[PDB]
Amino acid sequence: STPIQQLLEHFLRQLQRKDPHGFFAFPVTDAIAPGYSMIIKHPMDFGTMKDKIVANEYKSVTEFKADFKLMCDNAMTYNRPDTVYYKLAKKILHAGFKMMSKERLLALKRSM
Amino acid sequence: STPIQQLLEHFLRQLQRKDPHGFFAFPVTDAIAPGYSMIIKHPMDFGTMKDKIVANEYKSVTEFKADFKLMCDNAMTYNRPDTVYYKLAKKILHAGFKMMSKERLLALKRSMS
């Protein structure tokens, strides 16, 4: 790996740790979630994010964060507020954005 | 746990792969190298650097690079130029400052958005 791949893999691992049951690990299928592919036109999941890291497709932590935000947003859009998926998405969106906050990235940038 | 620790571990693994015989793995003893402590007053080795990462004692990649350079510099100071230890220290020093150069660090710094 390159260093940037290492940093992204670290963040991804930290995020995945917040999803022990692997809800966000792979794309949501219509067989599990009726209408999903019509409601969510921009699907995303941690597997796809890993693959983009491996294929070296991310230029920046901002790009990585945007895919994470999309993933959580999709879950909060498709699922009703009282569901496990909505509540978990909400919790991890906020936690992940704190973990990768502008301030934390600035201190990391300083430490080089 | 933590981004800096992961990055330093990455650099450290890549450097240690260039020392297959493990000459730099642990502190050099006077038993191994006579008179070593009489000459080298600020010893360093990969083991100590690893412990420092794990204990999160490195606050910058600069602190890290300086320890690495000290390690190599010690080997070139104690051993003569036609020895395996001097030659390897020179080789790995060059390798490390290529890997952890300002150019390469700027590219990473930029990737932190």
Ligand SMILES: CCOC(=O)Nc1cc(-c2ccc(C)c(NS(C)(=O)=O)c2)nn2c(C)nnc12
């Ligand atoms: C006049 C003879 O001079 C020397 O023997 N010099 C040096 C010797 C070795 C060395 C040998 C054997 C072994 C097994 C190891 N590995 S270790 C320290 O973990 O036990 C290291 N490292 N070294 C380093 C660095 N810098 N100088 C030397």
